[model samples]
Target: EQLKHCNVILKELLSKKHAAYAWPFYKPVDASALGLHDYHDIIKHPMDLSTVKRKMENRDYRDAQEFAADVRLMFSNCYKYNPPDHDVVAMARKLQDVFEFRYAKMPD
Candidate 1:
């Protein structure tokens, strides 16, 4: 799963490189900087906990259930985030729906 995320990021970098750009504004650390080699580095990529925390803190949850659901999903899907699977996407969409329907009443 980690490798999947790293690969996605690296592929994006490669695209940028092809376009004759040095790197993007939010460039990830190089493999060598983290004492990693080409293939091995990506597999051992670490989760950016700060980023996750910041996202969670910034999210607005009007109800306790909605907040609890977000927290549950965050922990339950932490590992799955790297893989970018259908279930992960669905969960993300669920959160988006929560925000979109903030003012709307739930159907009984």
Candidate 2:
């Protein structure tokens, strides 16, 4: 039940509604394409919805906490790499809050 709930919530977050800003979080950031040469150096452990989905399919998460942590890490990586005023950072903040709210509403 818990696993199903987490997966569903993640899927919702990855949906088209969030697509405009969510594109960056969908897959690993292409630092070279984006010209963010220092991204990898700053964010040692990158996270993305693609990785999360793969892990979900592989049953890599032991619990909701672990799943939530990875979601948060993706946002954290955005904040770590982008400045406070960045559009992506704002999007991350919005999406993170949405994730947390949905996560909290679920039954453990």
Candidate 3:
């Protein structure tokens, strides 16, 4: 459940399906790659929960690694669009604080 919850948060952050803000997020990738495993979306009863987001497009990663890689991409995009370094690191740190993967978890 923790993994699922963390994955949900991370996906929402990267995909703009999040509740935090409404802005253009970094576009991750297509559906094909996310089909692989070792990692997966911790979807529960299962719902789209999609919402108005950073862009017209969305992303689906193959695994946690893919999702995380794109997380940086989206965050970089946010940094480019919004505040500079201070806010970037601050927000990035806050958002990343929750992630806990099998091998490496995002540092608090």
Candidate 4:
């Protein structure tokens, strides 16, 4: 998964300088040909906590936390909106609630 993410980022970053190889998987197209930004929009605009929570429940807390932290870092580095449309304060409160709930139910 990490390799795939790196490859996708590399492909997006290089597409601007190498138009011929931009759409190698499909057709030869310029970076502007798709009418999209130079970088992947998804990487620029991360998902909200609601989405993260759903993913966490479906997968596992560790994976979800890793993904959330990665996207948060990306937003910080790029100066983009890391939390997206979700309320960070509310999300943090809910996260605390979840952790407390889990802790209360854990075996001693």
Candidate 5:
């Protein structure tokens, strides 16, 4: 039951019910194809939704916090790579709030 919570949170964050901004984040970012050559330099710990899902598929996360950290990092990397008012940044902020609020309410 402990590990089960992580996948629940993951699905909520990745839900298609959100705005289209999530489209950019649904999959891995292709730096070369997108011409974001310096993205790697700025986001040293790059992460994405699919990466989280794939990690879970491999049973890579040891616990809830570990999974949550990756979700937070994906948003953090977005903030680092994009300007404050960017659409993507705004989208990340909304999802970040949802994730944090939900995680905080979970049983310990």
Candidate 6:
């Protein structure tokens, strides 16, 4: 599931936390790896790729959210095949604590 991280990317972008100030971590996804071209003539805001590495806008957040959902489905399928009995602790939690993460769209 190459596109597994779509929702994760969108939630961070549309976050209300950054909306109060400026667009903090809005790094757009570069589709160039697959020999595709997606150049933005207008760089809307300051782009940051260090935190999370996917770029997008509110216009396409829904589409990206759907794409990530599909990728999550694939994972769910495999997990269903062999489910985990214990809690799956994510690694990012450690760093996430240090930084701010008021999601654009939440109930995550």
Instruction: Pick the winner on lDDT between candidates 1 and 5.
Output: 5
RMSD of every prediction: 16.6, 2.2, 12.8, 15.6, 1.9, 13.5
- Tens digit of per-residue lDDT, candidate 5, span 1-108: 768876676565457655364567878877878877688778756677777778789999878778777777777777777779977788888777776677786766
Which stretches in model 3 have alpha-carbon errors above 4 Å? 1-18, 21-60, 85-93, 100-108
Residue 73 shift from truth in candidate 3, angstroms: 0.4
Model 6 pairs whose backbones collide: 14-104, 15-103, 15-104, 27-55, 28-55, 29-55
Superposed by TM-score, candidate 3 places the C-alpha of residue 18 at a distance from the truth, in angstroms, of: 7.8
Residue-level lDDT tens digits of model 2 in 1-108: 888888777656567776766667677867778876677789867677777878989999968889878777777777777778977788888877777678678866
**Model 2 off-target regions past 4 Å?**
30-37
Candidate 6: give its CA RMSD in angstroms. 13.5
Name the lDDT of candidate 3.
Answer: 0.41
Worst 10 residues of 3 by lDDT: 43-52
- The sequence of per-residue lDDT tens digits that candidate 6 reaches over residues 18-104 is 332214223333535543242223322222332333333333334445544433443343234334553322212322442333223
Q: Rank the candidates by TM-score, best first.
A: 5, 2, 3, 4, 6, 1
| TM-score of each predicted structure versus truth | 0.22, 0.83, 0.35, 0.26, 0.84, 0.24
Model 4 C-alpha lDDT per residue in residues 15-81, reported as the tens digit of each score? 5643333232122223356764644554444334344435445654343346646535533533343
Global Cα lDDT for candidate 6: 0.36
Better of 1 and 2 by TM-score: 2
Kindly indicate the candidate among 2 and 5 with the higher lDDT: 2
Clashing pairs in 1: none
- Which regions of candidate 1 fall more than 4 Å away from where they truly are? 1-85, 103-108
Best by lDDT: 2
Instruction: Say which prediction, candidate 1 or candidate 6, comes out ahead on TM-score.
Output: 6
lDDT of 4: 0.41
Q: What is the lDDT of residue 44 in candidate 6?
A: 21
Assess candidate 6 and give its TM-score to the true structure: 0.24
